[PDB]
Amino acid sequence: NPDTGQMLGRTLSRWVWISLYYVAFYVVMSGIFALCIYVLMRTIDPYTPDYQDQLKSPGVTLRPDVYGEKGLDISYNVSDSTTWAGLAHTLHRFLAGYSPAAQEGSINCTSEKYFFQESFLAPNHTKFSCKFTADMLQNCSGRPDPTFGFAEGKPCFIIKMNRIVKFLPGNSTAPRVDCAFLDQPRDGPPLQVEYFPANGTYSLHYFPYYGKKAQPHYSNPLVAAKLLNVPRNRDVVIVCKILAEHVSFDNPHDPYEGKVEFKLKIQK
Amino acid sequence: NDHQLSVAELEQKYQTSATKGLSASLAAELLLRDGPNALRPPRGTPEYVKFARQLAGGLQCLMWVAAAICLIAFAIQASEGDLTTDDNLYLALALIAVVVVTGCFGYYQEFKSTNIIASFKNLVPQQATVIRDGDKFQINADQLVVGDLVEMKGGDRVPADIRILQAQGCKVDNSSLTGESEPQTRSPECTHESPLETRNIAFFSTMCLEGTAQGLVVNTGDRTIIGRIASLASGVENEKTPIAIEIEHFVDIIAGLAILFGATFFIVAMCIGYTFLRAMVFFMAIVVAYVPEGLLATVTVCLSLTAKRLASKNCVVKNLEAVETLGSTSVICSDKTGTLTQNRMTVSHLWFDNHIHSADTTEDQSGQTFDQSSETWRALCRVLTLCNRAAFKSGQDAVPVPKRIVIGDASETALLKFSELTLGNAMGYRERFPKVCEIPFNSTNKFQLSIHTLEDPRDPRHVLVMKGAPERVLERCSSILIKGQELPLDEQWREAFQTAYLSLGGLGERVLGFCQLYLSEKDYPPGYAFDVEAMNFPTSGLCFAGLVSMIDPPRATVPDAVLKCRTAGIRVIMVTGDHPITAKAIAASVGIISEGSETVEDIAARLRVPVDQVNRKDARACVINGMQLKDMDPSELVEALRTHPEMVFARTSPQQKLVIVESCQRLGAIVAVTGDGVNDSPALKKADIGVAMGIAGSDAAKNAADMILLDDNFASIVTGVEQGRLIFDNLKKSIAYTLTKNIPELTPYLIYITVSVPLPLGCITILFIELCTDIFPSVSLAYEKAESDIMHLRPRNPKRDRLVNEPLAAYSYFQIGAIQSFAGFTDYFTAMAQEGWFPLLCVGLRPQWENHHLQDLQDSYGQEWTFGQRLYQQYTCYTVFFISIEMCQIADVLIRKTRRLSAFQQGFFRNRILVIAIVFQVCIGCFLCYCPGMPNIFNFMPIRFQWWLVPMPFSLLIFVYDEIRKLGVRCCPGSWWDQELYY
Ligand SMILES: CCCCCCCC/C=C\CCCCCCCC(=O)OC[C@H](COP(=O)(O)OCC[N+](C)(C)C)OC(=O)CCCCCCC/C=C\CCCCCCCC
Numbered sequence A: 001n002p003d004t005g006q007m008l009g010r011t012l013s014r015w016v017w018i019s020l021y022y023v024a025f026y027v028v029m030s031g032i033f034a035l036c037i038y039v040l041m042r043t044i045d046p047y048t049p050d051y052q053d054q055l056k057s058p059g060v061t062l063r064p065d066v067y068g069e070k071g072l073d074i075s076y077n078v079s080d081s082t083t084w085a086g087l088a089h090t091l092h093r094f095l096a097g098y099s100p101a102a103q104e105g106s107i108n109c110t111s112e113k114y115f116f117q118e119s120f121l122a123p124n125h126t127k128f129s130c131k132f133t134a135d136m137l138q139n140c141s142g143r144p145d146p147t148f149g150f151a152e153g154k155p156c157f158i159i160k161m162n163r164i165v166k167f168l169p170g171n172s173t174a175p176r177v178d179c180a181f182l183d184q185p186r187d188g189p190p191l192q193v194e195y196f197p198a199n200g201t202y203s204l205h206y207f208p209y210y211g212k213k214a215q216p217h218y219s220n221p222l223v224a225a226k227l228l229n230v231p232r233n234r235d236v237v238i239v240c241k242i243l244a245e246h247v248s249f250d251n252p253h254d255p256y257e258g259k260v261e262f263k264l265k266i267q268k
Numbered sequence B: 001n002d003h004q005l006s007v008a009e010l011e012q013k014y015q016t017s018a019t020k021g022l023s024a025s026l027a028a029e030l031l032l033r034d035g036p037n038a039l040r041p042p043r044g045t046p047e048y049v050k051f052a053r054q055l056a057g058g059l060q061c062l063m064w065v066a067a068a069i070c071l072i073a074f075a076i077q078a079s080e081g082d083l084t085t086d087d088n089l090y091l092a093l094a095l096i097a098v099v100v101v102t103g104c105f106g107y108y109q110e111f112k113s114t115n116i117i118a119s120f121k122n123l124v125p126q127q128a129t130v131i132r133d134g135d136k137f138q139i140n141a142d143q144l145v146v147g148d149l150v151e152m153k154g155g156d157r158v159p160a161d162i163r164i165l166q167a168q169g170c171k172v173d174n175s176s177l178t179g180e181s182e183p184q185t186r187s188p189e190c191t192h193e194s195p196l197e198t199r200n201i202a203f204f205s206t207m208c209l210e211g212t213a214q215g216l217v218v219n220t221g222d223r224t225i226i227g228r229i230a231s232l233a234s235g236v237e238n239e240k241t242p243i244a245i246e247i248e249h250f251v252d253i254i255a256g257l258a259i260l261f262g263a264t265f266f267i268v269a270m271c272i273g274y275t276f277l278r279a280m281v282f283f284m285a286i287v288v289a290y291v292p293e294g295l296l297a298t299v300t301v302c303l304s305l306t307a308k309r310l311a312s313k314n315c316v317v318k319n320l321e322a323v324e325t326l327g328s329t330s331v332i333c334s335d336k337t338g339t340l341t342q343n344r345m346t347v348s349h350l351w352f353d354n355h356i357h358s359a360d361t362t363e364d365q366s367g368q369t370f371d372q373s374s375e376t377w378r379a380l381c382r383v384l385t386l387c388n389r390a391a392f393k394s395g396q397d398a399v400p401v402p403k404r405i406v407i408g409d410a411s412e413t414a415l416l417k418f419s420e421l422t423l424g425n426a427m428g429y430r431e432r433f434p435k436v437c438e439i440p441f442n443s444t445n446k447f448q449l450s451i452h453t454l455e456d457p458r459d460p461r462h463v464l465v466m467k468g469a470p471e472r473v474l475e476r477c478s479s480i481l482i483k484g485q486e487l488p489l490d491e492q493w494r495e496a497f498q499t500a501y502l503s504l505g506g507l508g509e510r511v512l513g514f515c516q517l518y519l520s521e522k523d524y525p526p527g528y529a530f531d532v533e534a535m536n537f538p539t540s541g542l543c544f545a546g547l548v549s550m551i552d553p554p555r556a557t558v559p560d561a562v563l564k565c566r567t568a569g570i571r572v573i574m575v576t577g578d579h580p581i582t583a584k585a586i587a588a589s590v591g592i593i594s595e596g597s598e599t600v601e602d603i604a605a606r607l608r609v610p611v612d613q614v615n616r617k618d619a620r621a622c623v624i625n626g627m628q629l630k631d632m633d634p635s636e637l638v639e640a641l642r643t644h645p646e647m648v649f650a651r652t653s654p655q656q657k658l659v660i661v662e663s664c665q666r667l668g669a670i671v672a673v674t675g676d677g678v679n680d681s682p683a684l685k686k687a688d689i690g691v692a693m694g695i696a697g698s699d700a701a702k703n704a705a706d707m708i709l710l711d712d713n714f715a716s717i718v719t720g721v722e723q724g725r726l727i728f729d730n731l732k733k734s735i736a737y738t739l740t741k742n743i744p745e746l747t748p749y750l751i752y753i754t755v756s757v758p759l760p761l762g763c764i765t766i767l768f769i770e771l772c773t774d775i776f777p778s779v780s781l782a783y784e785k786a787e788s789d790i791m792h793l794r795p796r797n798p799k800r801d802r803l804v805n806e807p808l809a810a811y812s813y814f815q816i817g818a819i820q821s822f823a824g825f826t827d828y829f830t831a832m833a834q835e836g837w838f839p840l841l842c843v844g845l846r847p848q849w850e851n852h853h854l855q856d857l858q859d860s861y862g863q864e865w866t867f868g869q870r871l872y873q874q875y876t877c878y879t880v881f882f883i884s885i886e887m888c889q890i891a892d893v894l895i896r897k898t899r900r901l902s903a904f905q906q907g908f909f910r911n912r913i914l915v916i917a918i919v920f921q922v923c924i925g926c927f928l929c930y931c932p933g934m935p936n937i938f939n940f941m942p943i944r945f946q947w948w949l950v951p952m953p954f955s956l957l958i959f960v961y962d963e964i965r966k967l968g969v970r971c972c973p974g975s976w977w978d979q980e981l982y983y
């Protein structure tokens, strides 16, 4: 097939013309594709997504997030501080973004009601986002206890709801965190939790979320669940559900929709 | 050998007796020394071997290699660290299942064809008459041994190869073994030196037609002539079909492209920081991706549809690959006796009223008759009807006259059928003229005579009718019946008779003379005692009536079939064992030799010069006999084949037929052989496609053949040529359609690996595209009509005109599949952006996107997504890419209907099957998208309507671009555009 005169059954001049034709074809097709993408992005709304087909209910995440091989699994040793040093460091790093210095961009919020904003009255053509500071977590804020209760055997777990643009959980009451044993200890009592803020609620003035362009300083409200009667040296499964009118947690194909389930083992 | 030896020289080699035969003990010892007098059955092949052969082939082997690569990559990934490796298992299972199901379908086709053909094979025990130590008893044919003295009579099959010791009017039918169409006389005298052309040898499995014969068994079993032919056929190797060669070339192209792309992207993956193991897995994935899954099934279904169409015309193929060979065929080597001709002596010409007439010789009598309104004709018909002893078997009224069974000689059978066809009710006309005297045919008189009585009671004259050899009749018959008048012979009628007789003889026909002589009332009154031992009745001074000649005529459809084959550019060569004069006459009759074409002998006869003085380049026609062929070296055979376009091979042995076929194949031609007898079984096996007659064909010929004509209709060859060319073109179109969609199935994976976007297309949806949605549209392209007069084109050049070539592959992949890939990615990015993921965020997102430990990944709007929600978005991307591919494939199937003509010219809805396939494809796509449970079963999502509309402008672009390309091809033949953009 290769030869000096007719390389791969085609002369050198003919190769030039066929290569030029293919180059022109691909340039035209790439230009058409780029035009289509440009038109798409010109029709995309910068503040609100066109559809939310996969975001009907919010996901729920937990800090500190430590994974095993099927989900979240937290296991440490009250005696051995090196077992929970990493967990407390993760909590400190996560709460670093909730200091007043990191919340200077948000404003004070007291309405306890939907913060419906139909105008861009915040600086640089934005909308106001409301403050959430670490001290709202009281004993689970990292002060005066820098161990977040892991040293004492009553660890704090930060529960955060995924934010969805213009999603409304329901205004009859504030959405609430509820943690319990997935399968209650047949010998031990039911799980005893203390929540920060009180009642484990997310205030209704953190909703709705208007996206990152309208609210570049937005911060997800947090709820801290301090577990108080976890048995020692024993595997337990904890499920924390979000209780709200428009939040569902019955999805068999997404175990993080509306709730978070982790395994907990505390050794003495 | 045994025929050149004398009776004294014989009778001692085999320790036998020419009069008493063999002793029983010696016969038993010889039956131990040699086998029983029978042919060993073919070794055959086990059914599991036959099925396993269906699992081989170039495409099958490519798919097996691809499955092996899938399994090896699965082993590597599972042994290193990798989950989500079920895709390799799915691909391997799909490849293996397609190969196995296609093999089962092909095995079923072969089983059905074998059953249909073998239903025509029956079984009857064979017995023989033998003489031992003076006794005579009926013994089974396989019990005979060499030296056995046997007895044969008319109607009995010859039990072995026999040297004739005594014979009484013995004639044999050698048409199946040799090419000879006329009955051959067996005499106890040697008349040639080859055993195949001497009258003192009778051949095993031939039929004794009339008379009696005695002789010694000189050859037995597989050592007989037919056994030697069967052994020769066993040594001939069946080569691969043209379609299999084209498929192997296509596999080579696919493998080369796969290796090139895999190596390039292996280098790219190395350059972008992948490990060697991951880059090798990527290379293997690309190589496997280039292997189509449903193409084997599509090709097999198209071939089966063509086979069904052929079987509708009583043309059965024993294997699916044989439905294209006739379309590719450039040379047809045709047998004469029993294949081009009916293998039945028939009245062809009549010479009366100083004119040579032509009878209707077609077996259906759909031909041209002669003038039957003359006094000479009405006397000649009476003579030939009365002077005939042949008789039909009873119970034949719905059977046509040519196919009716009659009792008598071949010549008398032909005369009786001619009487029944022209006069009508030959039995009634014969009984209305009672016979009072009769003299049978004998070797000395060489004529037959009989005296009858007239039908009208008023006339007491007795009519004498005589039939015999033309010169032995013209020596008598001082008067001749010309135009209803009894003229004398004035040396001008004796030269007109001689000219007519010589012309009929030179036309390769057997001629009989007829005459009549009414008896006077005075000399021979009613009640006269005619004595056969006194010759009282007059045997001279008769009234000559006419000459009747007979030949084995062509089948009705043969001349037009040959004309159409020659019009299609196919060379037709007659290869026959029969005599050169008959072979040349038949070749002229059927159009193998054209009107005006002359041989060197004809040119020499016209120019009054010796044969060597003429130029062989002036002779279009040529006749080569077996003796000349035996002294001919391959160079001279090739020279003769190239020099003379119209070629006839006469007196050709089975080995010489094999040699001629081999020479034609060595010249680069694709050769078809049409035959019926055992003598063409080796050539049938050697041919690129063997075609055997179903009714007239021997078992050996039908076994050697690839195609069987059940109804013995030769025009089925023309049908096969047309269907082969059509299926070649339509397979080209279907393959282009199938190959197009492989590029939009592969490019998303390449972008997924290199750019690290979330996966746009999954393995399951790729399998659905390959095996469920596009198979029916690809198959429906087999119903496309021809775009031109496909029967006026020359046969394709096997070296240059390939089934899949570079323009087809390049167009289908890197223009149409490129457009489809762009459509798919446009829809992918549209669906992603409308749900919150902008393209730039998509770039490089794959690790976070697929991370099971990230449950709050942020999109372009800052919304946090769980892994499950991202996975459902990924399934939506799968679905939009799938729908883009389907919408573009609708336009692809529309544009693949034609290669040169416009869709408007060919018709959008003329292919109802194609329209139904499009409807079915759309319905299956909608079902997959919107059936409940699909997201968690097959990972198809209920997409929004606008994602159906995004690829539609791309489908329109495909259609418009192909229409413009074909317009440029049609309007500028021979231009750069036609040379580079036409496939
Ligand atoms: C053999 C030859 C193959 C050639 C293939 C195509 C090559 C070129 C393709 C991509 C390279 C970039 C060029 C095209 C750029 C897109 C056109 C364009 O100018 O768009 C504008 C956007 C910027 O707008 P914005 O977001 O700032 O506006 C926001 C407005 N608000 C806020 C209202 C939403 O720029 C963008 O999106 C940039 C992101 C576009 C790129 C996405 C990733 C593409 C990767 C793979 C696709 C390849 C497909 C190949 C299929 C055929 C294979 C044979």
Ligand SMILES: CCCCCCCC/C=C\CCCCCCCC(=O)OC[C@H](COP(=O)(O)OCC[N+](C)(C)C)OC(=O)CCCCCCC/C=C\CCCCCCCC
Pocket: B297, B298, B301, B772, B775, B776, B779, B782, B783, B784, B785, B912, B913, B916, B920
């Ligand atoms: C995965 C795919 C699943 C769906 C497969 C098909 C399901 C049934 C759908 C359609 C069946 C046929 C319905 C016909 C209705 C229209 C009426 C009609 O007028 O039509 C009768 C046709 C007449 O012929 P014509 O006038 O169209 O020919 C003209 C072209 N000329 C002459 C050159 C050959 O009768 C014929 O064609 C012969 C009988 C019909 C055969 C064509 C239908 C296709 C059948 C099998 C191929 C598909 C295989 C499936 C996947 C196998 C994987 C291994």
Ligand SMILES: CCCCCCCC/C=C\CCCCCCCC(=O)O[C@H](COC(=O)CCCCCCC/C=C/CCCCCCCC)COP(=O)(O)OCC[N+](C)(C)C
Pocket: A053, A054, B890, B918, B919, B922, B923, B926, B930, B941, B942, B943, B944, B945, B946, B948
């Ligand atoms: C050639 C012969 C054609 C015969 C007709 C084809 C079969 C028609 C049968 C059924 C189709 C309608 C019923 C299914 C849709 C409703 C189910 C649904 O729910 O879809 C909804 C969208 O619906 C619509 O946008 C409006 C309906 C449009 C349907 C698409 C059109 C399909 C038609 C295709 C034919 C194209 C023919 C032209 C090109 C080819 C020419 C030869 C999906 O909901 P979502 O994505 O908002 O939910 C997302 C939330 N998540 C994911 C949690 C569930």
Ligand SMILES: CC(C)CCC[C@@H](C)[C@H]1CC[C@H]2[C@@H]3CC=C4C[C@@H](O)CC[C@]4(C)[C@H]3CC[C@]12C
Pocket: A016, A017, A018, A020, A021, A022, A023, A024, B976
């Ligand atoms: C230059 C840019 C636009 C890309 C190249 C455009 C291509 C498709 C065009 C521009 C120049 C054109 C070529 C000019 C020269 C020749 C040689 C002639 O004997 C046949 C036409 C042919 C072969 C043309 C083919 C098509 C062609 C190669």
Ligand SMILES: CNCc1ccc(OCc2cc(Cl)ccc2OCc2ccccc2)cc1
Pocket: B069, B070, B073, B074, B087, B088, B091, B281, B284, B285, B286, B288, B289, B290, B291, B292, B293, B742, B745, B746, B749, B761, B762, B763, B766, B770
């Ligand atoms: C007509 N041919 C269909 C076809 C097209 C594209 C394609 O891409 C490869 C690929 C795609 C997806 Cl979605 C998932 C997995 C894939 O490879 C896995 C793999 C396979 C073999 C060896 C190593 C790895 C594969 C087959």
Ligand SMILES: *[C@@H]1O[C@H](CO)[C@@H](O)[C@H](O)[C@H]1NC(C)=O
Pocket: A077, A079, A080, A233, A267, A268
């Ligand atoms: C860790 O827990 C185990 C009991 O499971 C305990 O025996 C051990 O003392 C603990 N670690 C240390 C270093 O004390």
Ligand SMILES: *[C@@H]1O[C@H](CO)[C@@H](O)[C@H](O)[C@H]1NC(C)=O
Pocket: A108
């Ligand atoms: C926000 O309001 C709280 C409660 O009144 C107050 O303690 C805090 O100082 C305010 N934020 C400012 C001004 O930093």
Ligand SMILES: *[C@@H]1O[C@H](CO)[C@@H](O)[C@H](O)[C@H]1NC(C)=O
Pocket: A139, A194, A226
């Ligand atoms: C939190 O700390 C306060 C004192 O600062 C104390 O009264 C309260 O009981 C503590 N709760 C828990 C469970 O630590």
Ligand SMILES: [Mg+2]
Pocket: B175, B176, B179, B335, B336, B337, B338, B339, B675, B676, B677
């Ligand atoms: Mg024959």
